């Protein structure tokens, strides 16, 4: 996401945290 599903159209908190988890590794 650029900026429309982060701070301009929420992020659901179902997918954003997934890629974020994958960013960390698997959110530890």
Q: How far apart are the first and last CA of the chain?
A: 23
Is 26 annotated among the ligand-binding residues? no
- Known binder of ligand: residue 7? no
Helix (H, G, I), strand (E, B) or coil at 3: coil
What's the CA gap between 6 and 16, in Å, rounded?
Answer: 8
Does the annotation flag 9 for ligand binding?
no
* Determination approach: NMR
What are residue 27's phi and psi, to 5 degrees?
Answer: 55, 30
Sequence-distant (6+) residues with CB within 8 A of 21 are: 27
The answer to the question of whether 10 is labelled as a binding residue is yes
């Amino acid at each position: 996401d650029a900026e429309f599903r982060h701070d301009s159209g929420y992020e659901v908190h179902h997918q954003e945290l997934v890629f974020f988890a994958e960013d960390v590794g698997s959110n530890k």
